[PDB]
């Protein structure tokens, strides 16, 4: 409306009034994403964007966000005329969320840096006329709310968002851009990316947001970063306040992405009478295998990023492994290359610090070693098998000469006589990929045969003439 209802707790005048604010919409029939999402920009932009006279905390008065509010809601009611569409049995058409999306796009700004922080909200699509790709998807899922379309909701993967709308809400609509200088697909159905296998649509096992999902989705969304060195404090409290309420409410029951933003959090700093940070992780892991048949990477990526910082070298190699493992099952498409680029620096870049810190601390002396452990060599294993049965089948490579430096060097990092205890049947282990198969005559040598090596990763057929 906004409501007489919604109005009550005004003015916010610290983090805790936010919160309230948050579950007394979370307790309505609908949750008000406008309204939600216009103050979490307010308030993010006061403690990230500018924090000049700064006291406490940056009070939302009503005048003001009722003000914005009015500003949106007359934007989208006045450019989309709903007598123009007339909605068969209370759901929405393809044409009006194409319609509504066309609307918040053609408000931005015409030129501006696509990835620059805090463009995400309401408040800056108002204010700026700038938000990111994510950012569209959503303000068209607010903006069908503010038009009485409940049908139309978020649907997100682990690097995209779009629509779903329509009978039964089995619709799916392009509404915003993905990545850099691929052309957009707006209006159109999201099954040519489901039927190719691609990452960037999950084999379809992508989130379809409810109304209480799309507010997990704007609290995941908020940027407590206020440069490169320096996050806000405030910003950071009132995300993890946000999450953990979430949790209360089972609104992060299907929100596995969710989870593991809320275990960073409570790694940094910590709330008395809550679960660990590994305990949130595996609720992660959890809520992929049960609602998204175990094909989300990002669940086990998070969780091999803890072991990682706490140096746990043995866990994090199997979070790695099994993160390989869900790929393996995906064909590597023209517009995954995040997750690529993910692949690309834990094989090259964050394995082989590591190791070579583990080698190090071997030199000096530890006991139970990863290097001296034979299961965490068959994970380092299983991490390549899956990222060659991933390049399998699929329409462009994956693998290089660049990958097979790193790969020589992180299984020489492992004495003979440790690589010679992984039984590779066809610790035990299997491999997936015709690639690790045909290695595996290679692994067990006192002497790693680096150039033999080199050629069965990169299928590279021959060597130098002279
Ligand atoms: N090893 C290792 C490792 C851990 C690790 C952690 C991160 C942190 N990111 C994990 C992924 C998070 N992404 C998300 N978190 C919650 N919700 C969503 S919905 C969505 C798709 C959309 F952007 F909407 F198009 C993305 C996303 C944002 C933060 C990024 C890379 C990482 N590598």
Known sequence: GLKAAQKTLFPLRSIDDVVRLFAAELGREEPDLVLLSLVLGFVEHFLAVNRVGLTYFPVADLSIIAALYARFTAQIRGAVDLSLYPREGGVSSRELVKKVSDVIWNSLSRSYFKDRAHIQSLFSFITGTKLD???????????????????????????????????????????????????????????????????????????????????AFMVCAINPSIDLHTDSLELLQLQQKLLWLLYDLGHLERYPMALGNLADLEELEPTPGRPDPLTLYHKGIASAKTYYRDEHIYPYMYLAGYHCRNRNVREALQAWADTATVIQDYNYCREDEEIYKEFFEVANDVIPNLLKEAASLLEAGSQGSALQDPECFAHLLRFYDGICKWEEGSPTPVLHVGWATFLVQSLGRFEGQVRQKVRIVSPVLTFQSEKMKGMKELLVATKINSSAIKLQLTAQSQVQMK
Not at 161 to 186: I, L, M, S, Y
Not at 202 to 208: A, C, I, N, T
């Open 133 to 215: 790709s994510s950012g569209v998807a959503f303000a068209v899922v607010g903006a069908c709310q503010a038009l009485g379309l409940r049908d139309v909701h978020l649907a997100l993967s682990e690097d995209h968002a779009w629509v779903v709308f329509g009978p039964n809400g089995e619709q799916t609509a392009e509404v915003t851009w993905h990545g850099k200088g691929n052309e957009d697909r707006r209006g159109q159905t999201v099954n040519a990316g489901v039927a190719e296998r691609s990452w960037l649509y999950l084999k379809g096992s992508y989130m379809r947001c409810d109304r209480k999902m799309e507010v």
